[PDB]
Design a protein around this ligand. Structure first.
Ligand code: V8D
Ligand code: CHT
Lengths: 409, 426, 412, 387, 388
């Protein structure tokens, strides 16, 4: 185009893109900062970093890029490569890696009045402090802080982008339904934008975009919580087995090892911060300690069940507590209870005495076994109550955690 | 001397070519950029990363009236190669990429014909974002798209389009990704079912700006599941059936609980691996995940019921009473329903003999009760087997048949009758 | 104003960065190398790469950049950015990644006689084929190969730096700037100029400068955290010969547990060494050997259990077996009539049961004898293996001289 | 050198690096392309990507860069930056992760007659189809397709320097062996551009894996744990350890199958023979566990409820045992009188019940011996056939 | 701006960025270097690399860039691209994984008197000598050494802004605590160059780890299994489960040791206290397995083949049990029929003798178990008191 080339040659004859456009010394340049989110790619909790694919909607005015459309056959606007005009060095200040600037350098749109519009694109890694108190039933509050790296408040004034009609300001991240990809693990609840100042630094100002996002915890439920509930059921079961089965330690130790493995694997998905303990980890530790005490009490029960008068003498307090008082309360009462001829008589009498002694010994052994059974029943009830109450309480507390109706920003 | 040097110097230097100005006579005119995509290799599709890596050749074609010459004036030069950093090219960008690669990385020359037709066919490795539907894994089919937009100009200045072709004098648009039957490498895991290409327009926006149009190339691919079936599903199913088999062990073996617990722990290991192999999305629970949860719950029931059986087997008259109701329930009715099989010295001697007899009779009665409790336990575990194992087999068959009866819909764009296939142009 | 301005303006005006500074046609540029090591960052065994923080010092002579000090107020040294000068494209040839050049393109010091002194820092990732035969008591012999990427031996003559008239044939290590690694100790650090005689003086690959790092691993960490637990756990198999051979003895439980533990330790060792197939690590050979031994012990436990639990009903104890296993091998280590009939029957039955029990006890004793013999055999095997491995590992010493043929020490 | 500086200033004064180096536009440029493999960085089997460190030796004649040595002090050769002169655009078609063309623009050697020698380094991360049938004793054949991207055969023609690439300076892998290597030139017709031919040169390397890492770390443990399969049948049921041992064997086998699975690509083209062996072993082990549970259930069969049918007594107690040879198997006084008779009768009944129980135990023993013999037969035929 | 455009055109018209900004070549450029720590990205203990987010504030005078404000409409400050003026090649000596110098060339502020202020950003991946001896309660002290690479102290002089780096806008880590931080200027005299001073500034930060995370996720399970260690001695031998418990504990402790080693560098300079405790526990668990195998062997000793020696009986049945106070231990045809009854009685007598011998052996085994339990409890008490 002859006339567009002529206009370009006229505009940029003496235009210096390193000089901020200020018609008169002391003038400020109003820069409007908006943001459009196209895809909330990742939120890496291990490194506390949020990756987003966004457009950065900027707009300002350059008095030097002015012309009369009539003198150039009615050319209202131009698309000029962004490297040719001055732009404010608007960057993401709270990035995690070193990438400050934008990725894609699209053309700017300069209108005959001097209004410059520039909507670059970038993949930003922004550092986001993560609160783990309620992981995985947690909502995060991740921010992206944009400001001019170079110019301060005495040189550029930051404002909010205008809407499509150009009537009112847009105080929130813009989402284009035709170009937005739902994350699938996070749902966006609030997305306000707000200007921020520092009291001690009059030369500071930035536009911050907030993303209040709530995790959808189905994955963690299915793959971590239900298996631990089944393991806890087994741990409670261990106290219903009879000590004669010979499989009490197998069951209890297996439950303990399984829950420990679950904790170890889950340690890879939570941040290594130390400000609080996630609810999932608290539940896992609670179950682990409960199962360890299950192992210890099972060993105690086995020790009680394998005692005999030849080795132990039942003390009075054990008999008083476990034979008489508890069983009524636990509904586990037991049911209520000539030379040769002379030699032959002696032999029969010896056999009878042997049988009588054996019966008394067996009665005492049975008393010890009954003590073991009663203790095991008491432990069963106590552990069932504790496990149910603890699990229900922990997950009820987790369930009453939703982002506030007011973003406060 | 090479006439090409004279021609290029005439085109780019004498005529004052400006590579930052659209190639149009008048400002209000529009530029048509024809577009097509050739897939040379479907490198991978990481479900954990929700990324599709593809090796493609992205074809562009427009008209530049400033790069036109009379072939007779110069030697019969019917074509010319120029580097893209010397001429105007349209910066079409992949909008849905995971990384910062918005457009081709190798800028190859452009072919210019004497009539001004410019063609540009650079290669590219694109890492686009493809949401994964894990609902039917590993019998799933994915629907990944590559969305290309023109951000440097608005729809009033350049118009994206689909490359046209001729066969018998009528131009038909190319609504598919081009696959060369010999320059294409079939992927081991995925096979391409549909590959339409569509030019989308969004009427709620305006031609003022750069969100009014795009060209999207879709790629519907089905996973070949033999690998997972052989290496993940068969071992899991067999180990699961071992649990139901654990009902048949006698309580005197001392290994019922161990067998059931081993099966449960194996199921948990398989569940953990399945978790490792999929994205952490909450749209749906994978089919294999549902099966594993169901079978783990069922095996936990098996463990609890083996525990109850054991507790019943070790009862004795010294601690429990075999009531008549339980006796008739578990020794008369259920076994038939379940088809289960079936002078002073003389006085002292006499008193001692009587006492011995009494003790032996008591011991025999005690053993009789113990045997009755044993039979009760056997009845309980037989009933458990007949109640649980059918549920296990039916659930397995249902789950792994519903997944196998899951096919791509044979036509993309449900509301569209067109096949979008290379063999039948529109 | 700064007099260096006009000096540098005269030097760099009419100066082609692309032309080798050869005075005449047969002149050859003597490029001089000296490597200074400041930190041995790591040695990635899986990736078979050594990362080092070095300063490489390169010196040559460029007759074009020479002035007359008296003309410029006695300025005898200027700094010029390296991107404005001709450089000998000295690169690390044996890098793992594509990084050939140096990390930071520093300034070049230029003296009035033309001398060029360039000391860029670099983080070099170089290939080092790793020998695993003695892990974790191994010592590695890693090298850094430097050669010109552009010019051949007819243009550039690579040489080692000469300091005070005596050649510097080692990697320089400055006590001020040096952090000892903690896992590796440097024993030798020689340098030499090497020729590839398969190529002529052309071909750009004829001449090399190779800096060697012979580093010895400190093995305490691996001894404490891997080897000692592995050996202690593996020694537990022999205990299965003292557990009773019956239900609840748990011979097979202990045996299989130790077998699985050894397999896990084998996997762990596998995660710590490269996947090269030129040799099997020593600890890997030990683990395979003890796995085989413990599999044999599992079989032996099964055999002992099968022998001990035999009954006269199924298997009949012969006289040969009895004599052998219980002989020499242990050495080396109306109404009244009915009542009478009933009493006779009772006595007979009791006697029969007692005899059956006695036969069972005989079988149990045979089993115990087999247990003791196999225990001694297994302990012998295990001790021999462990001692062999210990000896082989503890006797691997780094060579006394950097190059076995040469008698020189290659130290400052 | 003043002479070299003047020469280089004269050569590039009116040189246009955009035009082809041909006297007439109808001629074609002959480029002799030769590949030099410096190292084989890795072969990522899971991702099917082969990372190599090569040098791409290229030669051609630029008639515009010729000079007479007499006028420049007898200079016969010079080195010029690659960015100052025309270069051919070679592209690696089957790139997978890296760069399509050369990115390290090193200097090139220019002869006084115009001949150019350019040997830039590269890191080719090319796609490699992995056949896992014989893993870890497999050999891999995958290639490097090189050709001119933008110029057809009538404008720029490429021919190979030699029939095979150059492995003179190849660094020994330590994980693969270069069985063979060859380079072939192809004329192809693409659907883009059906009128004119496009040339390319494909270099391929037959790589043989050295099977010592995986034999030590995978196969030997697999075999050792497989050989424990038979021990289940030799373990007496009274030991109370059959299920423990068999379940341990099965779980170890499946863990090893998973480990093998992590080392190969997820492609469904073919199944590894090692994996198929492991699957067969697992199926037999599960059958063994089923039969072991049947054996255990039989060994504890109470005679009270179960009566041994004739069809099992005849077969398992009278037929198989004789067949098999290798084994070594086979007032007050009135009450007192009444009580003694009761005791005698109860002992007789107990003896009968014990005889029945021992018959069941014998049946179990013969069953597990039959299974042991079947296992030995399978082992013998397998070890003979493999050899 | 027209005035600013003219000013920038005049400033750089004959300005050479290769020349030091000094009036006379004998002077030196006074550069005021100040480090501002924005964020502590990570501390990779395995690789011994510390990643930080910093801004490297630098100030100096360039007389060639001065102007009179009255001639340009009163402009007193401009912003020039840093690629247009002389910059000091300030380099991080102990770089480990990143770039040595500044790579993000941002604009710099320039007063009308020549005073320049340049505050570029950087990610410093420096080397940290990690000392794991109190992990996870450890304190790490590792630094960042900066200096001018190619100029000596007589040409370019660097001085710190203040005794301490600037942490006004520091982002709280949540994993480490900034106990202390200082910056020191060093004059070195190398051997290459023994006549001139080589300047250097070294910033160091004393980081104190916050241990809650590692406590909860590593130590508590390790301690729990350690406390399960001695439980086997209370398990009766008739249960037939001692090997299960002992081996499970041993393997759990081994797994936790392997978990801990992958959390620290492989250096042999020092051994972590937690790992040392874990190995001590493993040694005692191995001893427990051996001694409990001995106990199991004793418990099933056959009375027929073995006869209890007198010393064993005296030690383990007559003296030791009294010592334990808290325990509940204990301290024609008719002729044949008559002969059969006599046989029954004799066999019962012999069986009773044998069973009493066996019960004596079992009592000895239980006493050994209980001695070992009390010894392990003594170790528990002494360790708790001494350490805690
Ligand atoms: C200072 C070491 O203290 C301990 O190990 C210590 C203190 N309380 C408990 N333990 C452990 C469990 C222990 C007890 C007995 C033997 C070995 C280890
Ligand atoms: C040779 N290709 C067909 C691949 C590209 C032509 O530009």
């Amino acid at each position: 185009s002859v006339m567009e080339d002529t206009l370009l040659s006229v505009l940029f004859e003496t235009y210096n893109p390193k000089v901020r456009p200020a018609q008169t010394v002391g003038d400020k340049v109003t820069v409007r900062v908006g943001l459009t989110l196209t895809n909330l790619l990742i939120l890496n909790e291990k490194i506390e970093e949020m990756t987003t694919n966004v457009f950065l909607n900027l707009a300002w005015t350059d008095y030097r890029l002015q012309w009369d459309p009539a003198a150039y056959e009615g050319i209202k606007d131009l698309r000029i490569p962004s490297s040719d005009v001055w732009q404010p060095d608007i960057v993401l200040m709270n990035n995690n890696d070193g990438s400050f600037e934008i990725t894609l350098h699209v053309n700017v749109l300069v209108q005959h009045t001097g209004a410059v519009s520039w909507q670059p694109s970038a993949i930003y890694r922004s550092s986001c402090t993560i609160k783990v108190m309620y992981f995985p039933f947690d909502w995060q509050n991740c921010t992206m802080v944009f400001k001019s790296y170079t110019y301060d408040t005495s040189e550029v004034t930051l404002q909010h982008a205008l809407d499509a009609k150009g009537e009112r300001e847009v105080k929130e991240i813009v989402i284009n339904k035709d170009a937005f990809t739902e994350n699938g693990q996070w749902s966006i609840e609030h997305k306000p934008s707000r200007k921020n100042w520092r009291s001690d630094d009059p030369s500071y100002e930035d536009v911050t975009f907030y993303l209040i996002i709530q995790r959808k915890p189905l994955f963690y439920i299915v793959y971590t919580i239900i298996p631990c509930i089944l393991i806890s059921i087994l741990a409670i079961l261990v106290f219903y087995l009879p000590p004669d089965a010979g499989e009490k330690m197998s069951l209890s130790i297996s439950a303990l090892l399984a829950v420990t493995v679950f904790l170890l694997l889950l340690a890879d998905k939570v941040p290594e911060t130390s400000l609080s303990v996630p609810i999932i980890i608290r539940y896992l530790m609670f179950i682990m300690i409960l199962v360890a005490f299950s192992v210890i009490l099972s060993v105690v029960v086995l020790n009680l069940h394998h005692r005999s008068p030849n080795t132990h003498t039942m003390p009075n307090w054990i008999r008083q507590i476990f034979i008489e008082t508890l069983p009524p309360f636990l509904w586990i009462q037991r049911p209520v209870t000539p030379q040769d001829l002379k030699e032959a008589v002696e032999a029969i009498k010896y056999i009878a005495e042997q049988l009588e002694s054996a019966s008394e010994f067996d009665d005492l052994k049975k008393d010890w076994q009954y003590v073991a059974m009663v203790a095991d029943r008491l432990f069963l009830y106590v552990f069932f109550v504790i496990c149910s109450i603890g699990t229900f309480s922990i997950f009820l507390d987790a369930s009453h955690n939703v982002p506030p109706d007011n973003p406060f920003a | 001397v090479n006439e090409e040097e004279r021609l290029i110097n005439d085109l780019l230097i004498v005529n004052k070519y400006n590579k930052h100005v659209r190639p149009v006579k008048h400002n209000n005119e529009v530029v048509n950029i024809a577009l097509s995509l050739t897939l040379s290799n479907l490198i991978s599709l990481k479900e954990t990363d929700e990324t599709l890596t593809s090796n493609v050749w992205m074809d562009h074609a427009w008209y530049d009236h400033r790069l036109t010459w009379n072939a007779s004036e110069y030697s019969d030069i019917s074509i010319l190669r120029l580097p893209p950093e010397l001429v105007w090219i349209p910066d079409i960008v992949l909008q849905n990429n995971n990384d910062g690669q918005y457009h081709v990385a190798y800028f190859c020359n452009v072919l210019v014909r004497p009539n001004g037709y410019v063609t540009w066919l650079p290669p590219a490795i694109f890492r686009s974002s493809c949401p994964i539907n894990v609902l039917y894994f590993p019998f799933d089919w994915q629907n990944c798209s590559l969305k290309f937009t023109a951000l440097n100009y608005d729809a009033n200045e350049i118009t994206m389009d689909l490359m046209t072709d001729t066969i018998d004098g009528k131009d038909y648009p190319i609504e598919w990704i081009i696959i060369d039957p010999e320059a294409f490498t079939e992927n081991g895991e995925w096979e391409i079912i549909h590959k339409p290409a569509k030019k989308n327009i969004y009427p709620d926006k305006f031609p003022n700006g750069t969100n009014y149009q795009d060209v999207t190339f879709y790629l519907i691919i089905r996973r070949k599941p033999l690998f997972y079936v052989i290496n993940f599903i068969t071992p899991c199913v067999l180990i699961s059936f071992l649990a139901s088999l654990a009902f048949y062990l006698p309580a005197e073996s001392g290994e019922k609980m161990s067998t059931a617990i081993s099966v449960l722990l194996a199921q948990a290991v398989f569940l953990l691996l399945t978790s490792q192999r999929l994205p952490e999305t909450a749209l749906a629970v994978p089919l294999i995940g549902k099966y594993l949860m169901f079978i783990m719950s069922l095996v936990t029931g098996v463990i609890v019921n083996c525990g109850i059986v054991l507790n019943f087997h070790f009862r004795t008259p010294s601690t429990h009473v075999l009531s008549t109701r339980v006796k008739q329930i578990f020794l008369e009715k259920l076994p038939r329903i379940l088809h289960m099989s079936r002078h002073d010295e003389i006085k002292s001697g006499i008193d001692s003999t009587n006492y011995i007899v009494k003790q032996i009779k008591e011991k025999n009665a005690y053993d009789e009760e113990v045997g009755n409790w044993n039979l009760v336990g056997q009845t309980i575990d037989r009933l458990s087997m007949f109640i649980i194992t059918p549920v296990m087999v039916l659930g397995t068959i249902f789950i792994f048949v519903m997944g196998n009866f899951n096919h791509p819909p044979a036509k993309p764009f449900e509301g569209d009758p067109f096949d979008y296939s290379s063999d039948h142009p529109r | 104003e700064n007099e260096e301005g006009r000096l540098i303006e005269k030097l760099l005006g009419d100066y082609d960065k692309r032309i080798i500074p050869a005075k005449t046609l047969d002149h050859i540029i003597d490029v001089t190398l000296k490597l200074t090591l400041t930190n041995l960052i790591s040695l990635n065994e899986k990736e078979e790469a050594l990362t080092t923080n070095v300063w490489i010092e390169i010196q040559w002579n460029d007759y074009r950049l020479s002035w007359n000090t008296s003309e410029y107020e006695g300025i005898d040294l200027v700094r010029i950015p390296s991107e404005l000068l001709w450089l000998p494209d000295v690169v690390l040839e044996n890098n793992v990644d594509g990084q050939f050049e140096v990390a930071y393109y520093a300034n070049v010091l230029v003296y009035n006689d033309g001398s060029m002194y360039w000391l860029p820092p670099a983080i070099y990732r170089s290939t080092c084929p790793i020998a695993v035969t003695y892990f974790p008591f191994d010592w590695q012999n890693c090298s850094l190969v430097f050669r010109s990427q552009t010019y051949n031996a007819h243009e550039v003559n690579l040489q080692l730096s000469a300091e005070e008239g005596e050649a510097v044939e080692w990697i320089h290590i400055d006590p001020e700037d040096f952090t000892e690694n903690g896992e590796w100790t440097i024993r030798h650090r020689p340098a030499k100029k090497n020729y590839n005689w398969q190529l002529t003086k052309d071909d750009t690959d004829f001449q090399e400068i190779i800096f060697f790092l012979i580093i010895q691993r400190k093995p305490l960490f691996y001894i404490i955290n891997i080897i000692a637990p592995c050996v202690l756990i593996s020694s537990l198999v022999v205990l299965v010969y003292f557990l009773p051979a019956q239900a609840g003895g748990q011979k097979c439980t202990l045996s299989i547990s130790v077998l699985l533990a050894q397999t896990i330790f084998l996997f762990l060792i596998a995660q710590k060494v490269p996947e090269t197939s030129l040799n099997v690590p020593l600890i890997g050979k030990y683990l395979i050997f003890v796995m085989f031994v413990s599999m044999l012990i599992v079989m032996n436990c099964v055999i002992v259990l099968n022998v001990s639990l035999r009954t006269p009903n199924t298997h009949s104890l012969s006289e040969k077996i009895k004599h052998l296993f219980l002989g020499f091998l242990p050495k080396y280590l109306p109404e009244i009539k009915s009542c009478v009939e009933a009493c006779n029957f009772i006595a007979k039955s009791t006697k029969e049961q007692n005899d059956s029990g006695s036969e069972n006890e005989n079988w149990v004793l045979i089993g115990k004898v087999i247990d003791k013999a196999c225990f001694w055999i297994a302990l012998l095997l295990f001790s021999i293996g462990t001692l062999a491995i210990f000896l082989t590992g503890h006797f691997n010493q780094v060579p006394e001289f950097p190059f076995p043929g040469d008698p020189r020490k290659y130290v400052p | 050198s003043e002479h070299e500086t003047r020469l280089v200033a004269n050569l590039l004064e009116n040189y246009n690096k955009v035009i082809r180096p041909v006297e007439h536009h109808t001629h074609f440029v002959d480029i002799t392309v030769g590949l030099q493999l410096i190292q084989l960085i890795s072969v990522d089997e899971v991702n099917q990507i082969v990372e190599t460190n090569v040098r791409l030796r290229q030669q051609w004649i630029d008639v515009r860069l010729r000079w007479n040595p007499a006028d420049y002090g007898g200079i016969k050769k010079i080195r010029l930056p690659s960015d100052d002169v025309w270069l051919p655009d070679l592209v690696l078609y089957n790139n997978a992760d890296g760069d399509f063309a050369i990115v390290h623009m090193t200097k090139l050697l220019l002869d006084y007659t115009g001949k150019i020698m350019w040997t830039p380094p590269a890191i080719f991360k090319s796609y490699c189809e992995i056949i896992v049938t014989h893993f870890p004793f497999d050999q891999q054949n995958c290639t490097m397709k090189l050709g001119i991207w933008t110029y057809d055969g009538t404008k720029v023609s490429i021919s190979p320097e030699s029939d095979r690439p150059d492995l003179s300076t190849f660094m020994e892998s330590g994980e693969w062996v270069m069985k063979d290597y060859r380079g072939w030139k192809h004329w192809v017709y693409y659907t883009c551009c059906p009128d004119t031919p496009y040339l390319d040169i494909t270099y391929h390397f037959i790589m043989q894996r050295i099977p010592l890492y995986f034999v030590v770390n995978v196969i030997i443990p697999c075999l050792l744990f497989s050989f424990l399969t038979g021990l289940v049948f030799y373990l007496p049921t009274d030991s109370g350890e059959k299920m423990t041992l068999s379940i341990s064997v099965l779980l170890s086998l499946t863990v090893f199958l998973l480990v093998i699975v992590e080392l190969i690509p997820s492609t469904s083209s073919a199944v590894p023979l090692i994996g198929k062996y492991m699957l067969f072993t697992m199926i037999f082990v599960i059958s063994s566990i089923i039969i072991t549970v049947v054996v255990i259930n039989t060994h504890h069969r109470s005679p009270s409820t179960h009566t041994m049918p004739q069809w099992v007594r005849k077969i398992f107690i009278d037929t198989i045992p004789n067949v098999m040879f290798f084994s070594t198997m086979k007032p007050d006084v009135k009450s007192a009188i009444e009580g003694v008779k009761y005791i005698a009768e109860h002992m007789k009944s107990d003896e009968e019940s014990s005889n029945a129980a021992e018959e069941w135990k014998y049946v179990a023993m013969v069953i597990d011996h039959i299974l042991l013999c079947v296992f030995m037969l399978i082992c013998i035929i397998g070890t003979v056939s493999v050899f």
